Design an enzyme around this catalytic site. Sequence first.
Site, PDB file in Angstrom:
ATOM      1  N   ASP D 214       0.851  -1.188   0.000  1.00 35.55           N
ATOM      2  CA  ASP D 214       0.000   0.000   0.000  1.00 35.55           C
ATOM      3  C   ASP D 214       0.884   1.234   0.000  1.00 35.55           C
ATOM      4  O   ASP D 214       2.098   1.129   0.214  1.00 35.55           O
ATOM      5  CB  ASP D 214      -0.930  -0.010   1.227  1.00 35.55           C
ATOM      6  N   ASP D 216       0.268   3.777   2.166  1.00 34.68           N
ATOM      7  CA  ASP D 216      -0.070   4.425   3.427  1.00 34.68           C
ATOM      8  C   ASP D 216      -1.199   5.451   3.213  1.00 34.68           C
ATOM      9  O   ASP D 216      -2.232   5.120   2.622  1.00 34.68           O
ATOM     10  CB  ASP D 216       1.192   5.036   4.047  1.00 34.68           C
TER      11      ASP D 216
HETATM   12  C1  LIG Z   1      -3.059  -7.059   7.403  1.00 33.30           C
HETATM   13  S1  LIG Z   1      -3.109  -5.327   7.710  1.00 33.30           S
HETATM   14  C2  LIG Z   1      -2.010  -5.059   9.085  1.00 33.30           C
HETATM   15  C3  LIG Z   1      -0.512  -5.295   8.792  1.00 33.30           C
HETATM   16  O1  LIG Z   1      -0.049  -4.410   7.765  1.00 33.30           O
HETATM   17  C4  LIG Z   1       1.364  -4.108   7.906  1.00 33.30           C
HETATM   18  N1  LIG Z   1       1.349  -2.804   7.223  1.00 33.30           N
HETATM   19  C5  LIG Z   1       1.087  -2.715   5.902  1.00 33.30           C
HETATM   20  N2  LIG Z   1       1.009  -1.437   5.491  1.00 33.30           N
HETATM   21  C6  LIG Z   1       1.183  -0.669   6.579  1.00 33.30           C
HETATM   22  C7  LIG Z   1       1.202   0.772   6.835  1.00 33.30           C
HETATM   23  N3  LIG Z   1       1.011   1.650   5.817  1.00 33.30           N
HETATM   24  N4  LIG Z   1       1.425   1.166   8.099  1.00 33.30           N
HETATM   25  C8  LIG Z   1       1.623   0.298   9.106  1.00 33.30           C
HETATM   26  N5  LIG Z   1       1.626  -1.042   8.945  1.00 33.30           N
HETATM   27  C9  LIG Z   1       1.393  -1.567   7.722  1.00 33.30           C
HETATM   28  C10 LIG Z   1       1.525  -4.127   9.419  1.00 33.30           C
HETATM   29  O2  LIG Z   1       2.851  -4.568   9.760  1.00 33.30           O
HETATM   30  C11 LIG Z   1       0.405  -5.004   9.974  1.00 33.30           C
HETATM   31  O3  LIG Z   1       0.857  -6.243  10.565  1.00 33.30           O
END
Ligand SMILES: CSC[C@H]1O[C@@H](n2cnc3c(N)ncnc32)[C@H](O)[C@@H]1O
Lengths: 270, 270, 270, 270, 270, 270
Positions: D214, D216
């Site tokens: 992603d 963010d």
């Molecule tokens: C399945 S959604 C949650 C997971 O996404 C990961 N992650 C993915 N994208 C992000 C983001 N933008 N910010 C923080 N954690 C993220 C994290 O480590 C968490 O375990």
Amino acid sequence: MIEQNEKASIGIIGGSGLYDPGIFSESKEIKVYTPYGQPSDFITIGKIGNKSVAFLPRHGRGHRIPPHKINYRANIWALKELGVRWVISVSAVGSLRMDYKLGDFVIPDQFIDMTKNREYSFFDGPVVAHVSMADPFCNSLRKLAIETAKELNIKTHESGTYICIEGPRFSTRAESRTWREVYKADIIGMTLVPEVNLACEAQMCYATIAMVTDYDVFAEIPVTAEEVTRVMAENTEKAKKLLYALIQKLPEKPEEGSCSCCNSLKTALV
Amino acid sequence: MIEQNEKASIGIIGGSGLYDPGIFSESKEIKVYTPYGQPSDFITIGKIGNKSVAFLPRHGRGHRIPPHKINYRANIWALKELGVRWVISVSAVGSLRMDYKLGDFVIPDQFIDMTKNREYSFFDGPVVAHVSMADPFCNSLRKLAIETAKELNIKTHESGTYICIEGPRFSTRAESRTWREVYKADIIGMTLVPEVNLACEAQMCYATIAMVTDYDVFAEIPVTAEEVTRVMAENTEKAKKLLYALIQKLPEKPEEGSCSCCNSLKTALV
Amino acid sequence: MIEQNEKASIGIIGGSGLYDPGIFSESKEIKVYTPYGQPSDFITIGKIGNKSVAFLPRHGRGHRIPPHKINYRANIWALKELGVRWVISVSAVGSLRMDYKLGDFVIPDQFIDMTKNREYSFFDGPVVAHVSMADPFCNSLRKLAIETAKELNIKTHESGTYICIEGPRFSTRAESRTWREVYKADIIGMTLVPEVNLACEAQMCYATIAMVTDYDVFAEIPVTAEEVTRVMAENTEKAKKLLYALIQKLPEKPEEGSCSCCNSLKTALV
Amino acid sequence: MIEQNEKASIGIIGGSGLYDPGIFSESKEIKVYTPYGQPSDFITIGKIGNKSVAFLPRHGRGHRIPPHKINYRANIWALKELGVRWVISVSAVGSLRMDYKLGDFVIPDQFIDMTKNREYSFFDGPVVAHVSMADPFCNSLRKLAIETAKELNIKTHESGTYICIEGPRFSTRAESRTWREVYKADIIGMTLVPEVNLACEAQMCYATIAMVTDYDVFAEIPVTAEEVTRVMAENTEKAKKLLYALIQKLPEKPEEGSCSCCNSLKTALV
Amino acid sequence: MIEQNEKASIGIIGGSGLYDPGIFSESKEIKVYTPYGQPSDFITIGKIGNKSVAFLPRHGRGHRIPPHKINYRANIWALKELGVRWVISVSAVGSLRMDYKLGDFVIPDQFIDMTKNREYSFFDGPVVAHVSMADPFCNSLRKLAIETAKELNIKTHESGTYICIEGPRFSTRAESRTWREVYKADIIGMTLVPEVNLACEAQMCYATIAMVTDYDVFAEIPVTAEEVTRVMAENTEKAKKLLYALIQKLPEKPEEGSCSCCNSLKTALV
Amino acid sequence: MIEQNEKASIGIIGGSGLYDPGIFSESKEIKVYTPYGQPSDFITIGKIGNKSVAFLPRHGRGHRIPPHKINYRANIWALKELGVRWVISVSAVGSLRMDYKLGDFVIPDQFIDMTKNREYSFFDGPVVAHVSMADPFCNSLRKLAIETAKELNIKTHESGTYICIEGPRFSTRAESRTWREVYKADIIGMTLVPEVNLACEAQMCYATIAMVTDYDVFAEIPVTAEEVTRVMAENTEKAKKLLYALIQKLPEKPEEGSCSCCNSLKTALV
Ligand SMILES: CSC[C@H]1O[C@@H](n2cnc3c(N)ncnc32)[C@H](O)[C@@H]1O
Ligand SMILES: CSC[C@H]1O[C@@H](n2cnc3c(N)ncnc32)[C@H](O)[C@@H]1O
Ligand SMILES: CSC[C@H]1O[C@@H](n2cnc3c(N)ncnc32)[C@H](O)[C@@H]1O
Ligand SMILES: CSC[C@H]1O[C@@H](n2cnc3c(N)ncnc32)[C@H](O)[C@@H]1O
Ligand SMILES: CSC[C@H]1O[C@@H](n2cnc3c(N)ncnc32)[C@H](O)[C@@H]1O
Ligand SMILES: CSC[C@H]1O[C@@H](n2cnc3c(N)ncnc32)[C@H](O)[C@@H]1O
């Protein structure tokens, strides 16, 4: 474990200097069950206009609970049990910028979390949830607060970044320079997080009405607790007018397109 | 904090040697939200006869959780969120009396709590509840279990006092002499409390089907975990037959007159 | 997480009044890693006869740690890391019976656990173990202690039930009547459990040499801490002689047929 | 407290969407003792090429464990007891920079720890250790991962700073502006710390293969858990190919000159 | 950490049904600092006769705190900070004997502690204290309570053993038979321990005035919370008369000769 | 809970490499009661010039306690019980700037708190206090330290911002770049917070004498514990001279006008 018979659609969480919200005509105090133990106080429930409203002073009777010991999960759980959909927080904040003056209200739109070792979530497993909070406050409620302030002609800044620190000590000068220069923060307090997170997880429409009670480290005499209480006291009447008006303005239920946390748990659940 | 769509009226909590209850035709495993975190495993839900049944192995997959670490509050909360009204526990116990035989079932009617470091209640304040446990098991469910055993011709003692110890070590001889000669207890285990307390607080009708897997310290060779496992394995088929029949026999809802915990919170609330 | 280079086959755990065991010729103090944090003190390691011996005062320097705060898991883990096979505990106890007099030694053979809220095990999951402790002390070490006392002509009772209470307060008269009448206890202390449990789980050969330092509530003047320390001081020389002799008497490794906890974990593992 | 018979030289810790690594031919699931209690799941052990490999999904079965509740100490301890020398982490991250594309891999070389309530160390006293983390990942393993990606022609960024946040909520816009514009971080996740710290303390060579799932808060629609899951699923085959190849490529033991944490405890111990 | 200016020589701790002691003419509520956090409520302080008296309801406002969650250390610390020398507890108890009838008062002289997992002491190290509790209540205060009851012609049993259980559930029939027939207890409650221990450690003169509110399991209908509340309400006037009279009868300071905890810490210190 | 007869007006808290301050002529070690349990070690008390001085090594005997496990509340409470008014901390720090060289002293005037999950206050309720920390160190004591260094011709930087990290690991390169370029920190350590906060809450006059023991990540070889120890050993004599001189220079009591924490609790109390 308890059937909660009382119902309210609007919850008010009062901060420093707001143990008595001065909004109720007839009301009563109730104990509300939570699996996290004690909310900060008994909840006050009563009718305002056509609305059933619940009130909770986050520091409890006599301001006996400091920010780091507030049972945020119990407070939000209790409001959820009552059926609360809208949560209005009223808080005291420091200003980190000259143009956000004593007695000004601020309706923040962002925050930065500098707390430490608080309990941040209702979801500890096995149901894992990661709520989006890019825009952490409820847009529809923020907009209604802003409209109310405009209608009342009450001086109010319509945006701002709240930096939440752990406390209970106030910031050092080096920290405050960082907040204002590093994090681009506008106001500062100790109680927003995890209250706002938990409200979002509970699918509530949460917004903060902050009042500037001090200039943090930036005036000739740095912030003290005595100053915060004094300034909040000078402005309670204004806060109460804003609160009373906003409560009656609220629609029955928050709009889905205007509340990011309302019914959005689906995409947050892994 | 999330809506539980799955529903079951009967819950089974499986003890040692009963990870697979062998009662389901079609079933699935679900994760259930609790404010106390993780239940021992995902719950197995499926239909038996006209009944929706939930199953939970209290020690989890691979018997990975010892009695002192079981999340009793999460397990009972999870069953409550599924709408469970009847809880059947199946448990391995030692016999403290030498007139019983290995493989006998016992439907205890009393207990003595000698546990040491557990969480005993859902009610930590501000809603204080003190549940009556003079007769700690659900009479209607005990009676139905006894009738089922009689109908199947399965040797079963129709009363008994269960002494619950902390573990994970087994008792010393001096302790066991006390349990039997002084307390007059009949059977001994590590998992009944606070499971039974919590079920009562949750207004669920709870009963234990215990199977004698050892003679504690009183045979030539004292109890070992190996013996408990072995003897439970020798008698699982019998346990499954009893369980399957009992589940079919249950009425839709326990009676208030034959269930002391059902809808009785009223007089327990201060 | 640390490679422990020091080795000892015998561990001594000293109780009240035994900060200095008076058994070493040359010795040094070492810090020993444990995943449970701090042992009560640095361990003293040195040679006695052909034996490498480790010593640990359970109350630490200056008797700074009360029984309820002792890090029993760290203490036993530390000895295990050193390769300890035999653990000799020296303790101060109250007598609950007239014929177990001040200054008498007792080699107990049973115990009753009346402690509360201590951490009882090394096995919290996922490897579940239920150690048998019907005969909770190591027979071979008890027998060697008894032989040593006989050889030295030191007055010593060759059996006894130790009741372990939580403390730090001493017992009420009603409690002590119970201990002596209900639990059939002979001596009383605050430190045996969970030390003995943990030693068994660690596959050590553990035994207690207790010295009677008071008559609990049963003399004209009830037990006080001052009395315990005074009486232990009057008898340290005897204790040291017994200890020094026993240490040299010990075989290299405990016999399997004479140590119930040695290599017996296999049948304790679920 | 028990002897670990199973051995593996390489450990894989799987993140979101990687419960089944899809690398094993023959394998079994084992329970591994730790003094910190439960690892996230039973460890999967099996042979790949000439290597014995251990796998652990950090969120457990069904993604039941959120980042703030993962037992990082138990997971790393378990791998240590198996003899693991190399630890490959596979993790879902957000990109804070818009020149990266969804599905890109990143092999970070730095991190910034913004976690709030974790247990950071195996060393709580009396053996005090302060491990150097200037270059927090194992250089030799990072280099081998980079070579593998090049050999496979899998698009991979060969450096980057991972900001680790507490969660479980995602960041606010104000927070993310700080992470990117001020801290100059490249990727963001919730699970790196204290996993990386603990691996270093355990003298294991650790590296992260991160996949961008992603942007963010920076795309038109901010990150959601649904998006993370979806994008990870789209790229699992690629991740498995990289993983399978890298595992085959590893030498038996990391070099001391290319692994700062390997056998480096000496200078970290006070 | 703050200087307490308020002073009282007598403290009253009120139990069930005694939130309002009805003894004060003029009074105020104060917050008292403790290093253990929150006392059960604000302390009510005021003059009665020539005495400054402090009152604390142990269950707090609205009976919001159950026995297992009471902050006993904070309550006793707060009283110590005020200079309290005499502590009068008023408590609701069950009778385990059919000659101790509803509404009868009992001045117990002994106790048996069956609580689990509470915090039992102010002395956790490095100053180790083991208080003598052979006669756990203050003799001088018991004698004055007895004299007061005789003078007022209020039916009162002049001795008795209080068994303190953990709760919040009431006892099973098997437990209750055990308390009476085995432990020889006369009355039962949930709040005496550790309140009495801590008062002794604080060198206060503590005694309990118990009122029989139920027959535990021994009447036709077993005890319920509703019954306890009802019976205590029926007898509050009587309790208030006793309390008011006793308070005025107390000498300025307890005589060391008739108060075993007064100035006796010296021999309790190791 | 006990009367402290020992008195000192000056407290020294020694950091790494300063277990023996080398300032005492005659002295003794004492155990000091605190409601928070164990201080880091017994307190050394003795006379220097006309001053009674108390010394505490914050890491304890043998440097057994890491920064994250130090009982900061017990240490500061113990000093308060002794009557300490001035607190001089001596601490090892890293330099984040190449002009603050090894062996240079620094008298910081500001700090930034990057710790996580420590206990930050003595005030957890019901007496809520928010101390001002804009200028977090005692000005009068800083000025005296600076004068002493000038008089002794010891190279000392007269200001600086100390960033306090959690540890026990050292910072990554990315973190260190952030501390310097972003937070504008000058020196880095692990122990200042919450020691300084708590001293302020206790109304003490606290200042830090820091010695630069390393260049963090910025030299050719990044900081290691071995380096910190070595460099502090090279400069202990210099530190002892500074300390000895400063102690004798201190006036009897700090002037309220030059000590912001002295007698300032009044305006901090809500
Ligand atoms: C399945 S959604 C949650 C997971 O996404 C990961 N992650 C993915 N994208 C992000 C983001 N933008 N910010 C923080 N954690 C993220 C994290 O480590 C968490 O375990
Ligand atoms: C009554 S003084 C303490 C309260 O003031 C609020 N507050 C007001 N000004 C500030 C400031 N400058 N910094 C931090 N918190 C503040 C905090 O949220 C806290 O609950
Ligand atoms: C599998 S061995 C451990 C289990 O045995 C049960 N159990 C069987 N026999 C006994 C006994 N004699 N004493 C205590 N628990 C027992 C306990 O509840 C525990 O979960
Ligand atoms: C120094 S006094 C306290 C110590 O005395 C031991 N002890 C001695 N006599 C008794 C007794 N009668 N009851 C309980 N513990 C006792 C306990 O184990 C405790 O560590
Ligand atoms: C208001 S009901 C709960 C209270 O009753 C007191 N109590 C009264 N009767 C009993 C009883 N039979 N057993 C235990 N506690 C009792 C306990 O101390 C508790 O605080
Ligand atoms: C003996 S090595 C560990 C100690 O070094 C101090 N210290 C020295 N240099 C640094 C640094 N660069 N970063 C963090 N802490 C440091 C810390 O406060 C810690 O107690």
